[PDB]
Every structure is written in structure tokens, then in C-alpha cells.
Amino acid sequence: YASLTEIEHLVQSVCKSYRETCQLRLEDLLRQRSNIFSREEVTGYQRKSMWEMWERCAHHLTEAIQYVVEFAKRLSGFMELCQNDQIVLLKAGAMEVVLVRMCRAYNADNRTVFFEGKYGGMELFRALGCSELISSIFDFSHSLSALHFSEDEIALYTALVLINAHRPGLQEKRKVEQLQYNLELAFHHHLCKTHRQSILAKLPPKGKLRSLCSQHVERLQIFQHLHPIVVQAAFPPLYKELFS
């Protein structure tokens, strides 16, 4: 892009796509912070079977991914890429975007996340048998939350998470690069304008999102090997398309 008016138009445009595609409004999440699972409800979750809690989490991830697909569809540049590259970007990026969007549903004051209507701590997911992954996700959401990420910042940051020209498989790499650099300009322009450039050094390192995504795939492979009929019969088709 040439001149601040085109960059600023991009900023507004990205922010609007984000707002139209967030599953939960931020104030609905904040208004729920006192609604916290009782210890008896926590115990109830801990006693659910591994396979039932996997199914539930997969369903919830699938719904979050659907909103990310709509997000990508509303970024003009994205829908200008060829279909192969759209799919490449979405298969590598969708989970990373959801992982970023989850910080909004995380309360750093008590280390809880909004899940199935109330806030609960990481002990809520014990039945999954993936304590390392869960703990890493909570840690990631705590990092971002410490930054006090604004809605506008999440918009712009998650547009960049998705439009990543380093994804293996991209055919029009140069085109993705150009889009990535315009979105980087937009993000950094907005940071400069809002006096928020101090967060650049505090953003999680390159590789942290990859690490969560790869742990997620690794834990999935173990679960699937234990309960292959559950995955086939009861995991959402989109989930399996992205991760199995």
C-alpha cells in the first residue's frame, strides 16, 4: 500500500472483519467472569470419559474454526488468492488463530477459561489426558492476557497469523508475501498510532503457535490410536479434515 489513508483503510477493514466474525462478544465474556464452575461441577467434568471430553472439545474447536473460516473469507486479499493457497493457509493457520482468540475467554486474575457456559481452571480438562498441552494453552492465553490485547490488536494480529507467506505448499508465495507485508504495515501503523509499540518485543516467539498446534496433532494421534471408532463416528468432519 502507498500513503497512510490506504493503510488506515486496511486497519478498519480488518478490524470490521474480525468484529463480524468473533463467535463471542468480549463484553459477554467479561460479564460472565463470576460464573465459575463449582467444585462438584469440576468433579463431574473430571469423571467424564476421555473419549467424551475429546469429542466435546473437538466439537467446540470445530465451531471456533468455522468462525475463523468466515474471518478469512472477509479479508479481501485472502479471497483473491487461489483456492490451493486459501486451503494451505487455513489448514496451517486456523488452529493458531483460535488459540489466539481464546485469550479473550481467559481470566488471568484466577486462571480460568470460559467453557460450556462457565469459567473453569485447567483442572476442568483432566479427563483428556493431555495435561502438557492444556497447560501450555493456558500459559499462552496468560501471556497474551498480560499484554491486555485490544480487540483491534487481536484483529490485526490474527490476520497476520493467517496470512503467513512461510506456509509450505503455497503456489503464489509472492502474492502472499505482499498481503502479509501490507497487513504488517497495518498492524504496526496501528500500534504506533496508539502508543502500543512496546508490545512488539513482548509478543510470543515465532514457533510458540506451531508448538501448540503440533502438540495438538500429536495428542490427537495418540487418542485416535486408542479410540479410532470414536474419531470416525463422532468427531466433526471439518475437525478430521484439518487435523487427522
Binding site: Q83, Q86, K91, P237
Partner: peptide
């Protein structure tokens, strides 16, 4: 396949 349908609709 599901992605392709979500992107097309």
C-alpha cells in the same frame, strides 16, 4: 472437501 464447500458458499 468441507473447507472447499465453506470457501465456495
Amino acid at each position: 472437501k468441507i473447507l472447499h464447500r465453506l470457501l465456495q458458499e
